[PDB]
Amino acid sequence: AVTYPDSVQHNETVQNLIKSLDKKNFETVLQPFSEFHNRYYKSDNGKKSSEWLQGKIQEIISASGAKGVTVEPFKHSFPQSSLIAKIPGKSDKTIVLGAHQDSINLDSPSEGRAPGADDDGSGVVTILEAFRVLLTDEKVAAGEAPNTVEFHFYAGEEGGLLGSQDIFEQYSQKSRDVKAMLQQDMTGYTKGTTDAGKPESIGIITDNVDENLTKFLKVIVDAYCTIPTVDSKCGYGCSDHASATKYGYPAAFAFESAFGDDSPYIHSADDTIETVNFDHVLQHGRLTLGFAYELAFADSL
Ligand SMILES: *[C@@H]1O[C@H](CO)[C@@H](O[C@@H]2O[C@H](CO)[C@@H](O)[C@H](O)[C@H]2NC(C)=O)[C@H](O)[C@H]1NC(C)=O
Ligand SMILES: [Cl-]
Ligand SMILES: [Zn+2]
Ligand SMILES: [Zn+2]
């Protein structure tokens, strides 16, 4: 059982970090990331895209001056490796931000074009940019936050959550102490919402998640985003948060829209960067920042 703050504790600090978010950084990474023919987890394509992503993560670390922050691959039985970046804090209580890094063309997995721009390139560059801004905080970069923060870039999600399955099963076996896990998977498609006359929102998924953490996630969005929430269910274990839930860890999941208004282009050649609304992924950047910072600095977790 894990419990959370009732209201945000660091509004001033987080609002100031939010000003350092740079909308252009999403596109600058997402454009070449989605130019891999696909990022299929069984393919040398997915191996190369994971290596490319690791270099982009490393560039941010080396640029940050954060001496103790690392990124390391996590090997699987398939060629594409997951990536775990760690910001060590004073305790081993760990906050995880997740996204998956593979893409797939369901009709032609090995050879088909799969730009995976919304699914899940949008979530990758969302948490990548929040990671960079988090490292501009001197306390975080010094290793001085109460809690440890990890950023997970899961391989093989399109095979059935295969990378996050390997990671959380190992974490569980080694008694890793994950106090919160936020998954972000598809953060850029708003056309489904606005086409129907609805206002742009953050979708909160309420199945296969922890009730207390999900309530905390709504607190984060109400404080640090400028668009409202909408609750939705997917009806199955639709992303890597379900791997955390499977091993008892508290997980939550923020989404681009109500589930029925999400991108109809996923898992095909049509999931392109032209479908992504970078003002919306900026809202997901704000919530990733606030979620990570508020929980990194919660002693009673
Ligand atoms: C977090 O801080 C922001 C300021 O950065 C607060 O927003 C301000 O609210 C007061 C109320 O009148 C005014 O100074 C401005 O209207 C707001 N400023 C901006 C830039 O929006 C915000 O209310 C705080 N939120 C929480 C939850 O504490
Ligand atoms: Cl999906
Ligand atoms: Zn996905
Ligand atoms: Zn998918």
137 CA → ligand 2 middle, Å: 33
Give, in order, the Cα–Cα distances in Å from 220 to each of 8, 252, 272, 287.
7, 12, 29, 6
Q: What is the residue with the minimal CA distance to atom 19 of ligand 1?
A: 15
d(CA 14, CA 211): 24
Q: What is the spatial distance between Cα 204 and Cα 197, in angstroms, rounded to a whole number? A: 19
Rounded CA-CA distance 194/199 in Å is 6
CB contact set of 261 (below 8 Å; sequence gap of 6+): 192, 193, 196, 198
Number of domains comprising the chain: 1
CB 88 within 8 A of CB 150: no
End-to-end CA distance of the chain: 10
- Rounded to 5 degrees, φ, ψ at 197 are 80, 5
Experimental method: X-ray
The answer to whether the CB of 127 falls within 8 A of the CB of 71 is no
Chain center to CA of 133: 14
Which CATH number is 166's domain given? 3.40.630.10
The DSSP letter of residue 157 is: G
Q: Whose CA is nearest to atom 20 of ligand 1?
A: 15
118 Cα–ligand 4 center, Å: 9
- CA–CA separation, 25 vs 142, rounded Å? 24
Ligand 1, CB cutoff 6 Å, lining residues: 8, 11, 15, 223
Determine the distance from the C-alpha atom of residue 107 to the mean position of all C-alpha atoms in its chain, rounded to a whole number: 26
Pick the atom of ligand 1 nearest to 12's CA: 2
In terms of Cβ atoms closer than 10 Å to its own Cβ (0-12, 13-18, 19+), residue 1 is exposed
CA separation for the pair 187, 97 (Å, rounded):
14
Q: What angle do CA 277, 24, 131 make, to 5 degrees?
A: 95
Give the atom of ligand 1 at the shortest distance from the alpha carbon of 222.
Answer: 27
The Cα 29–Cα 250 span in angstroms is: 30
Q: Are 288 and 8 in contact (CB under 8 A)?
A: no
User: Ligand 1 centre from 156 Cα, in Å?
Assistant: 41
Query: Which residues share a beta bridge with 180?
Result: 95
Stated resolution in angstroms: 2.0
> Which residues constitute the domain of residue 135?
1-297
Q: Is 161 left (phi over 0), alpha (psi -120 to 50) or beta?
A: left
The 8 Å CB, 24+ separation contacts for 137-143 are 137/13, 137/17, 137/293, 140/66, 140/87, 140/293, 140/296, 141/64, 141/65, 141/66, 141/69, 142/66, 143/68, 143/87, 143/88, 143/89, 143/90
Binding-site residues, in ranges, read 100, 119, 158, 185, 267
Q: Return d(Cα 221, Cα 272) in angstroms, integer.
A: 27
For residue 120, cis peptide bond before it (omega within 30 degrees of 0): yes
As a residue count, the chain comes to 301
